[PDB]
Structure formats: structure tokens, C-alpha cells
Design a protein around this ligand. Sequence first.
Ligand SMILES: [Zn+2]
Lengths: 49, 147, 230, 304
Amino acid sequence: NTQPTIRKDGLKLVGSWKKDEPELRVLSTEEILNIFKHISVKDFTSLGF
Amino acid sequence: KLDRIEFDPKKGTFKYLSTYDVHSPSELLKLLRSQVTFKGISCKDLKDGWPQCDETINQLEEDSKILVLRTKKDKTPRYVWYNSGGNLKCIDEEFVKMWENVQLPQFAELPRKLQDLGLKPASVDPATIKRQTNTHMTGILKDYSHR
Amino acid sequence: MSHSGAAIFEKVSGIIAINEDVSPAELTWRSTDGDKVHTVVLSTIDKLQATPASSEKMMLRLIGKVKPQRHMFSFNNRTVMDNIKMTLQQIISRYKDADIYEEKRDSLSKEKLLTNLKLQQSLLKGNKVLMKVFQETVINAGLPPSEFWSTRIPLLRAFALSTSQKVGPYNVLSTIKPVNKVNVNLSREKILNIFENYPIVKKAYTDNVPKNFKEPEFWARFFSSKLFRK
Amino acid sequence: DRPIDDIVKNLLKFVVRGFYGGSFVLVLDAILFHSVLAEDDLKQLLSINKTELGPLIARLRSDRLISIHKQREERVYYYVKYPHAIDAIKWKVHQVVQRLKDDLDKNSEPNGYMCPICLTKYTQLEAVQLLNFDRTEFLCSLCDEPLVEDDSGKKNKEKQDKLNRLMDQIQPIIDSLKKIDDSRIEENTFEIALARLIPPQNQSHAAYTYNPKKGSTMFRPGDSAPATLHINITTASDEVAQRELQERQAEEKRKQNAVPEWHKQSTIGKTALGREERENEKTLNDYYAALAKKQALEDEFEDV
Ligand SMILES: [Zn+2]
């Protein structure tokens, strides 16, 4: 799955996907929380957590 | 000439024509089941032509034969639908409130929770889905690319 | 089911149905409320046109044989269109062939042998040399017909056995190989053999050919059926 | 369609009619009978308002018994996702039964104590460390007042009765779930749901078509899921006619293989190359007849 280009607009994080103008949508806080809860124990330890 | 009046050649009379010819519960039950869509028939035009309908409509509501949408100001029947399901009332309010108290977990985590408790989940975490020289012959040669 | 589905006709949404039970098969369009109804007989259709799978539109058209009668129907799912188109291909192809075809088109003894006048009239029509003698010796001369055949018994017997003999039983359906277009050739002898070897085919053939549809459709209908496979 | 679909449809109908109000039955039953419905079409069909439809859809959306799908045509579409609804029903039913079972287990334990003044709950162990020096009454730490027994002794039977009644009433759901697991469940989608679409209105404004963006790598939250026969009958004169054709074809085949003329003979001496019965039959027929008497809109299209 192609990753988006993340930018911070105000207090919200907006990601833009490039097509095969690029699509843009707001990443909901719930979506980010769900993704963060799937990171493995070893994965985020390598990130310093 | 009007479509709301019916002519009787037998005696030569003019009678009112109701939108739906219903003067018996059996007729209403069959008429409602014949609807090709879920558009309920209004009570305003049903009360017209049927001297008593609320008594019959309410009677069928108790028997779980039809569905009734009632007003909020005072109990008054409006557009009705056929009850394709079972009994209209089968569960006490002590469980409806409990059903309201229970809050589902995160959708993506629900399938894993059921698998851990034994029950087979009828879904998977959305993290698993994987979105996958010579020109004189020009205009004469057909492209036989494959056989 | 493949005989019903949603369709849009003349800016009106409705349900399109395929009625096959009533012959000839007809295609009926009915609006959702039923206020509008349209029916087209498949026999009147020459070709069936359909938009390509690479196009957003789904207008399925049935052009009528002659400003040919055009009936355009719009679908929603490509799978539904393919399923409907596949079924319409069979009926259209079968009817097309029918139109093409329509436009394109014991008694072995002295006593009985001397009495079987039908046989006597049979061989005498075809044989020319005997015709020469028979006319001179029977018509004007007055010789009795029975006496004339007394000296020609072998000629009578040989001609009778030629048409009085039948081939032995054999597996007719095994020889029937279907061999898109598939061409299968049939003959009256095979048709008779099928009835003798299988009474069910004769039961269906006898009660349907004169009633509903012509024989060519029947055998085209029979082969496509699972009964032939069974 | 598959019979299991009817089982799933019946299961959803029972749940709404028993565990939801009246208008909820109307909303979800309509989509079951029909297919994906636009919000405007749903209001027209049921004659219900946005302020009245909102609470119903919102509650049915939180429980995931009805799914939403937004696409640019921004239009809102509602449909049913069978795998999601079954899981939610299965979990909630299990949770509800578990909640009652846990409550019954908890109630079977000693009652406890409470203080009338400060209304503070005290357990049996907690009270044992607060009794007065005279060992006569339990004194509240905050209020220094005698404690009063809580009213939880007689509820032991009430909770059991509710569980017994609920299981009998929920019996159809349990029976339906057993069959659902036995069968194979196919996950539904907007495009798949369109295969069973029954138009709500003759001229609905909503375009019930799915035109995904071309070349789109976009992934939104929860928008992806795991010939002719011809015959020829020869009737007593076509086999011979067909036989002649084969003989003609054989003759043509032989001609196609025949060598040229110059190969037949050595062409050295030649110059060098360089620049009536019917009447008889009629009288016969009459004679036999006497004999027998004697004895007695411009668009792209394709062709398929
Ligand atoms: Zn106190």
C-alpha cells in the first residue's frame, strides 16, 4: 500500500496520496490511534519507545 | 369523466372511489404485501373510504401483522408497512437498555477478541487485507499478433 | 434469476423481465410503479448490440430486422450485464438459425405377392423395360394381371425385399458428436433411430413439434438440453 | 440466491424487532427488502425527517448493523455488511449474556454495608476493620455512625430469572448463528450489493453506479474487503446433395495437387518461353385406378 505524504495543517494531520491532482484527506485521530496500536513491541523500541 | 367517481350502468349511480379499495382486514393484509416497494400507505387516505381503520390497524398492531408509524403529538397512526418479521414485541425493556449499555470495542480489534475467547469471528482485521522498411504494403497487413 | 433485473427505459427506471415459458420468447420491460410497460419479441431482433466493457455506459440494445426498431436498456453491474447478455445470446442465436433455415427451405408367398397390387404398381413405375411389355400385354392385349406376374415372381420378390429390410440397432447418440459455432449434421434415418432407441425422445417429439415450434428448433433444443447429456 | 442469505436476513429482522424501537425496524427492514438506498430516497420512502432519521441511522451505524459509503457523484449511501453485522450481534449477545452471568456471580457474594449519611459503600472486609471497641456495631470512619446493611440479598433470584427468560427469548438468534457458522459467508460490498439493486424511485436523483477513480492508489478506512449451436437436418435428398459436394471438394482437392502442364511433357521442342414416359405413367395410373375400382442516439456499440 502506497504511503502518503504527511503534513500538519493547524491541529490536524493531512496526508496526500499520489495517483498512478493528488488525492487529499484528513487522517482522523481514531485512524492514527488504531495504526499506533498495531506497532509491534520490537518495532517501536527501535524507534526509542 | 372524472376518475374519482364510478358509474353504475345497472342503476345509474355515482359513488366515491377511494384511493385503495380496502374495507376488510384481509384486503389490507394482501394489499400491503403486494407493494413492490417499502413506501407505506398514508392513514389520511386510508381513513377516507373506511369508516373505521384505527381500531383494525391497532388490532393488527397487537397481532404483529403490520407496522405502524405514529405521530409524536398524540398517538395517531400514519403510513404503515407490512411486518415481514416475527412478533413486534418479544424482548423486555430490561434488555433493550442493557443492549444500549454495551459498547462495541474498536472494529479492527473485534475479530481478534472473538478468536481469543473461542468464538470464530466472521471477519478479519483490516490490517490483513492486501490491496492488489517497406511502406507500399501499408494498410493491407492485418495484425495477426496471436495465431 | 437470469430472467429479471432492473433497467432504465426512456428516462424511466423499471424492471426488465425475460419471459421464456410463452412461445415465442418475448422481452418485457415494466416500470417500478407499473405505469409504463414495453414488450419486444425476441424473434423480431436481428442482432444484439452492447456497449464495450471499457465504457462507462451500459446501454444494451436489441436492433430489430427491417429505421430498425431500437430498444436500449441500461444496467448497473457489469456482471449482471454479462449474465443477461449470455442468456440473450442463446435465444437470439437459436432464433437466428430458425429464420435462416426457414428462408433456406407373411407377405413373401405366391398368394400375397400376387395380391399386393401396391407393390406391383411400385416396381412397374420405376422399371422401364417391364413398363414396355406391361402396357402392350395388359392394357390392349387383355392378359390377366395375375397371370402376368406368375412368371415374374423373382422380380417382385427382389423389389419387395429391397424396401422391406431395415438396418440393425446401433448406438445412435454415440455417433452424434457436437464437433462460437458448432455444426452437427442429422438425417431422417438417424431421427427415426433416436425414437426407436429412446421412447422418451419420441414422446417429447410427437407432442411438441406440431404444437409449439418446428422440428429444427426441437433438435436444436434437444441437443442443448441435459437430457441429451444424460 | 443462496438460502443462507435468507437466514441472515431473518436474523437481522429479529434483532431489530426485539432489541430496537419501532422506527429502527422500519429503517433496517427497508434496506433489507431493497438494496443500497440514498438518504433522500430513504426519507421519501419512509416519509421521515433528517432530525428523526438521524438518531436512527446514527445508532444503527454505531452498532455497525448498517454501513455507510461516501463517494463523489459528496453523496451518502447506506447498505448492509453481513460479516460486520453478524460479528457485532454475536459479540453483543455474548457480552450481554456474560454481563448477566457476571452480575449473577457478583450478587451471590455477601451483600456488604453502606452508611446512610455519606452513602459510602463498604464491603464485608472493609467493615470488619471499622467496628467499635465494644464489638457491637460498625462505625463509619467519616461519620462515626452505625452502618446499615445494603439491599442486595433478595436480588439473587431476580437476576437468575432474567437470565432464564432472556435465553429462551434469544433462542432464535442462537439457532441462526449456529447455521451461519456452518455455512460459508460471503462479504458484501457496494459493487456486490449493486448486483441485487431494486430501484427505489422511477426518477431517483441518486445515480446508483460505482465509478471508482482511475489509477487511484488511495486507500480509505474500511473500504476494501478480502457459445451457439447450429444444426442441419438432411431429409431424403440432402445427403446425396451433400455427397456430391464432398465429391466436388475431392475433385477440387485433386486439382489443387495436380502439377502444371509443362511438367507433364518435356518442353524442349516447343518454342522457347518469352513475351414420352409421362404419358405411359399416366395411363398406368388410370388403369390401376380402374383395377382397384374393379376389385371393390449514436454511441459506441459492438456486435455479439
Ligand atoms: Zn458515613
